[PDB]
Point group: D2
Chain length 481, copies 4
């Protein structure tokens, strides 16, 4: 039997029994113990929500979109099989997230295991495979009209993109291309994943969402673009699409890259790094794994959630003392201190290979200020944050197809010039934040002098509080006045 | 006694008895019969709200802001007298609006009376004067600690700006400069008027508001800028301020300049123009006025509201037949037809003196298309819409002062470069919309050919549906491909 | 231009409209056709809550947008039932007919909605028995005939004669005189329960106004209609196919009627809103001889007679208030003066409220006599003023769960998880002991038309004395407003 | 750096925090100091609604954010009263003390909130009498002492010994044994009514959870606390200064308790949520001998004994669920296995619900005997299975208006517009006949631990037979789940 579930965002949702079967497994239920916004909860007290409820919402919206397209255009031949496969991909897209979500694959794994290249999406494919195999899902799929081998493949492609390096997909053909655009849209980033998190994150954060996904659904059609049937938006809705990406950027700005939230994520990561040699997680065949190696074994990874934070915090093992001590500083709210923020000026980009060298640069600045303290490279954190419209330097709207009232089956393109002169001139930028691990008044004052001097030396933008935090430094640069 | 009133936007609000006294007059109650968004209601069925409830909200928020500043900074010496005067200005700012709000001073009066230069704000001063004088308000003001002559002057200045063409204000001195920034902020447009309408219009329209005025209040301080005490925002809130103006622009884009809403406003205006010789409104000393002359007599103007639409619609006078007939076409939904939209390309600006000449230009275009119909100048409407951040070409954030965490009493400035490269490169633009009054299939097809040809001739932007609506025209211009 | 299975694909793009309550709604072209008429557009000029706007400044909404929402929800419910139970053979014809009934249910409302058929017409024309629902049938008939709707109906698969009849029945109930309906048979009985549910009052009309009124009033709605839809099925009850709720949702259904009663209490029977409605009605009564409204064939009608001619009635909206307010005719001076007192907020003064005590009911035939009773009371208090019958207004308000003395849940059928096609009944005792023991009551409000402090003080003494004489309940503020009166009644102490 | 009247201006910028319910809240530095401790931060790891999250996927919220909201609202109410009535001489010291009590009221909650002191401790330690409120006092004492709070209190004008006492009294009620309080006198009685109102249950704790729980659950709140604040005054009642509501707000107060009862009904006593709480408790019981928690001086405690040591208790949160779930110790296998059944959604099965009929009350001393009664029933039905006492769970749920059998509105004082300083009482009969006639009741839920279809079918027969034998109410689905049983009882027909 279908179940009805009440979600605060979407209201009363129906879950097909096959979905219920997938949901009621250790692999899916695991997402109840992983916070959507990671350390954000320690800044936004409403942000208590977990990946579980987001995944349900994504599964639901994926079904909503596919159904709506099918009802409007029978000629697409969307089957209930297709609907289920998209719902399942929606449900399972986040299965590979680790403790504190983006903290894990964004901060911890790069530091704990530089030799690997890991993403939560790859994790999701592996965990999905593990969910299917450990819980006897294949016969249940068959029972509801799915073809497991083809459809499992299709689901994985929806999650992670083409699985092999020309129509690059095997699970569905070009005439159902639009099905790959629903859960995770690699072409332009317009997908139901965003739609759920905009609404859900806003509801919990206490920030109001200004994007209307239901309007989008109503104005969506499928049209022939090249040899594919693709989702197209109504032409006059282009402004709303630009606003959609604007909203994503505002949420990143206000909430997801919050300067304190990020420093909490940083501190948690430092603690995990201190604990990683001492915490054991039992995986397949009794083998032991670490926090950093649990990603190599889905049975161990199943048991790796936000609970690791509390295992550390409540530990008595002397070997965990350093890790424990960092988490206690989180609790006492003795956090690393924000120094400032700046950006590059020209066409200038900071390369990732250079990130590690930045704290030394800041330490090596020579502010012409008499200081009671001298600071070292290790005292500074330099966070380089890429802010963009989801496709690096590119305008996603250049990869959207539209239709017009007078010819609803004909796909067209719209350029930036055809829309508005008040839109962004660029679609990517970098923010550079600097923090100091020395928290006393005198270290902080010194840190600000080094930071502003560094901005001056590098021809970066003048920090907003520059004249206040470093009055002796800002005059030297008259690009700044 | 104070009254408590329940407003869906702000909840339970307290009204001081002096405010109640002002509210319970014919001059204020009049605002119950004027729609906030004018013709917008005929496109957005939730937009039934009137100026009355908006004015209450503006009065309330003005008090909220002033109170908050005063509680935080006693050194400002904000009195309850000051609070009342700002509330009253907030309440009374909209008293000068006419039938269908912006339709009246935006479309009707310019056409009905080209020789005058009229604004609703000027109207508000005159109506406020009339409210005070007709209802014995001055003694009531005295009773509550106001000084009528000075304070009435102060209120009018808050509404319309400096009354004489150096500190240009008389009602309050430089040390209370911040009081002029509350209701109608002529310096940068950050005021409580916007805050109420964002929230209220969104609530009724079915579009969600993404600006948080309460956060703004919490981060607001008053600091010395030159010799004035001015409102300053916290430095890191600059992004949110840019978003505030972004929200205003989105609302104008989606709702207030809706292409059909505007055409309904246009049609209502045409009807008023047809009726203007025949409708009589009795003013002071029994004198008769017209719709177009009621602005010269506050007693007549008091009786000029949205009711004029229904007076016309329900009239039987043969002399009102033409006017009545236009309104009936609104009811039957036989509206003028949208042809398209375009913009200028270069540094190019369309001057207001040239607006009237544009329909002739469109009619004089020579599309190389065989047409079954020929159209004249009078068949086209050309609407030129200025979209901007409230200060023409200027960036309002260049006229905002900020403070920093480390020095909260020190005002500073922040440039666009110091914020983000993803922000608008320009702050003003023009939209050009064209409509046709001939509604049959063949006229509309012809109208599109003339329109796109005109865009090509003028080097305007390619209409979004250009290739669809005029496939024979778009190839000639290879700036377009 | 495109083909599938060898046949040209036709793209029929529906109109989309954005409603703040229901979001983006699609309107079938037949609905659009009905909507874009003078008869329907008229509802833009009639406030949903009448005088309520003069108390709740958010309540600016008109009947127009409510009607759209009811039309939309009616379609939603019918669709959902049909999707879950194909065996019902709900057709798109049935869906359209229910949507149209939903849209058109309110066509007969007059100026300020319930003020008109609730207060004005009973006073202006005692000999007639008029209801807005009857008005809606007449206006619907007029809308159809004046706008050439019948061919358009045919074009979309409707059978005009049968279906027009069916729509009218949905609006007003059985039109005659055993299955009492002609538009649809017993196997589609559930279709009559969607727009206006005469059996138990569970319908989409309530669902829209709960959500819409709450949105505008600034009171939060606590009923969830979407949950209800999800738990609704059609089951055989007697020889009819009727809508049934899931058994465990019974608590929520009780709560639904609780919500309706709270909204009536807080908002629709607000003591000041009602007095504004009363004053507007008085003004209309003073204007009724002098205002002319042109109807069919140039005939003149009055405010009170416009209900006899749909062409005149089409032009009778909230505008009549402003026509009066802005008039210069000396003969309208009395009417005008009343409306000006509204603007200056010189309203009749609330005196108090009481209720009957026993199984005691105040009969409607006795309402008119109540102000004299109050005036004839003899309070043992030294007063500066003596008040007459004409100085008092006595408003008797029936508050109930929509079916007089009856529990609506006794007329609801339910189904159980284990046997979803079997209808059952649930009694009050099977649910909760914390529920109401009665389902109807009367509130008696008294007001005074003399507004000075002395008259008001006197009015309170007469009022509380009257409550004592009649063995009514002690007013909540009795000891404060009339300390010398309340001791005489020891049932009160 | 700046001066006014010749004295340097000091700028003390408060911390601002954004809460989705209350928006942007300012936190006094003393509050911040209390918040940023292990004892307070602990509340981040305890779900407000316990097992409710496993039914309502939005209910992910923890006690931490609720506590912040209660602290905030307590300050709001006290401030508002003081602004309107300076004569009360509410000081900023009083305000801080009430805020702190608000913040700290929930410090004593254990894993899954009401599951812990409601289900687990009674079962794990029958000899003790434990409440979360007592826990809160102990944890508050521990928070103060471990974090050097007393000097910080002094720094902001508090008198630690008196004020700490006062805070504890606000949390748990009178600490001893006539004015029963020591922290504040009778003229500040109203201060004890803010956080936890022992007299009638109208407090800010409810106001926060109504709004917060509704936000997360996906059920809309219909109570308006801000309206209440606007209509609240302090008046002399006996020799105390007490909070009084405006008279005409009585209906809204009844509605407030109606809302609380609906939330309990829909969400907090959800039949599946409760069974999840039951299963989690069973798992804790099987784990209790094997889990060690280190407390003061290295001493070891168990889940059931951690309440005896605040240092251990600090480390007892919802984490214990995952410790069990992820354990490999063979001795934890039984506990682990129960939690895995939760994950696989192999829950105990709901059988049905009934209530007592007369003035009949089931006594708590008899609860334990009920499963045997059910098992001893003799249904005249042919069954494949026989069930034992241990196969049944019988949950007896007390539903009431917060004061057992009593009407809380009988313990509320009101004021009237004309005499705002005079307290009065309003009886139920003075309000409405549509209100509850009783204010407390018992719901009896039965579940079966045997989950196969045959056992479930059998369980329903035993259950309905038991209801018949005990003259309980007929289950709502009785005729469907047990058609052969319901005819024997003609009180049911
Ligand atoms: N009055 C109620 C009852 C439940 N819920 C929520 C909790 C769940 O997210 C969803 C489904 O709850 P049900 O109680 O309807 O589901 P069950 O599975 O308990 O009922 P059954 O199995 O008997 O259908 O609705 C709700 O919002 N309001
Ligand atoms: N339960 C209620 C009652 C009223 N209102 C609204 C309508 C008004 O906008 C505001 C004030 O209503 P009151 O009924 O409190 O005001 P009155 O002026 O009628 O009461 P009184 O003069 O007796 O104080 O609150 C409300 O939201 N909820
Ligand atoms: N950005 C927008 C634009 C419009 N609307 C609302 C107003 C109407 O209630 C509904 C439909 O508006 P459209 O602008 O889509 O409809 P038109 O009829 O103007 O467009 P067209 O005829 O070109 O499809 O949506 C909205 O909510 N948001
Ligand atoms: Mg269930
Ligand atoms: Mg009043
Ligand atoms: Mg259109
Ligand atoms: Mg900070």
């Amino acid at each position: 039997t279908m179940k009805v579930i009440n979600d605060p965002i979407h209201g009363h949702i129906e879950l097909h029994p096959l979905l219920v079967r997938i949901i009621d497994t250790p692999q899916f239920q695991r997402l109840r113990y992983i916070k959507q916004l990671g350390g954000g909860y320690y800044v936004f007290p409403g942000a208590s929500h977990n990946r579980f409820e987001h995944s349900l919402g994504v599964g639901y919206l994926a079904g909503c979109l596919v159904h709506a397209l099918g009802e409007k255009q029978p000629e697409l031949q969307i089957s209930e099989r297709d609907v289920l496969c998209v719902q399942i991909a929606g449900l399972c897209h986040d299965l590979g997230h680790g403790p504190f979500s983006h903290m894990f694959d964004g901060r911890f794994i790069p530091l704990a295991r530089p030799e690997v290249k890991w993403t939560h999406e790859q994790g999701s494919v592996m965990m999905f495979e593990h969910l299917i195999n450990s819980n006897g899902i294949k016969p249940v799929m068959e029972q509801y009209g799915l073809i497991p081998e083809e459809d499992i493949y299709f689901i994985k492609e929806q999650i992670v993109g083409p699985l092999e390096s020309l129509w690059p997909y095997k699970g569905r053909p070009e005439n159902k291309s639009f099905l790959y655009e629903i859960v995770s849209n690699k072409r332009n980033g317009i997908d139901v994943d965003k739609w759920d998190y905009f609404a859900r994150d806003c509801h919990h954060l206490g920030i109001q969402n200004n994007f209307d996904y239901k309007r989008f659904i109503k104005f969506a059609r499928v049209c022939e673009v090249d040899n594919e049937l693709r989702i197209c938006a109504r032409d006059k809705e282009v402004g709303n699409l630009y606003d959609m990406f604007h909203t994503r950027n505002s949420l990143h700005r206000r909430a997801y890259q919050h300067k304190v939230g990020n420093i909490i994520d940083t501190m948690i990561t430092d603690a995990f790094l201190k604990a990683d040699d001492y915490i054991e997680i039992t995986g397949a065949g009794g083998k032991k794994y670490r926090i950093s190696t649990a990603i190599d074994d889905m049975e161990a990874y199943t048991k790796l959630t936000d609970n690791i934070f509390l295992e550390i915090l409540y530990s008595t093992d002397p070997k965990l003392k350093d890790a424990r001590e960092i988490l206690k500083q989180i609790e006492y709210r003795n956090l690393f201190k924000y120094v400032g923020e700046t950006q590059p000026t020209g066409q200038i980009k900071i390369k990732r290979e250079d990130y590690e060298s930045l704290p030394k640069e800041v330490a090596s600045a020579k502010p012409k200020v008499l200081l009671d303290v001298k600071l070292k490279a290790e005292d500074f954190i330099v966070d380089v944050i890429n802010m963009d419209y989801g496709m690096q330097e590119k305008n996603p709207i250049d990869h959207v197809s539209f239709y017009c009232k007078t010819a609803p089956n004909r796909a067209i393109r719209i350029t930036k010039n055809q829309v508005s002169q008040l839109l962004p001139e660029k679609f990517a930028e970098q923010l550079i934040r600097v923090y100091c691990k020395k928290v006393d008044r005198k270290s902080l004052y010194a840190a600000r002098q080094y930071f502003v001097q560094w901005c001056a030396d590098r021809n970066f933008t003048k920090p907003q509080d520059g004249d206040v935090i470093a009055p002796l430094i800002t005059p030297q640069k008259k690009e700044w006045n």
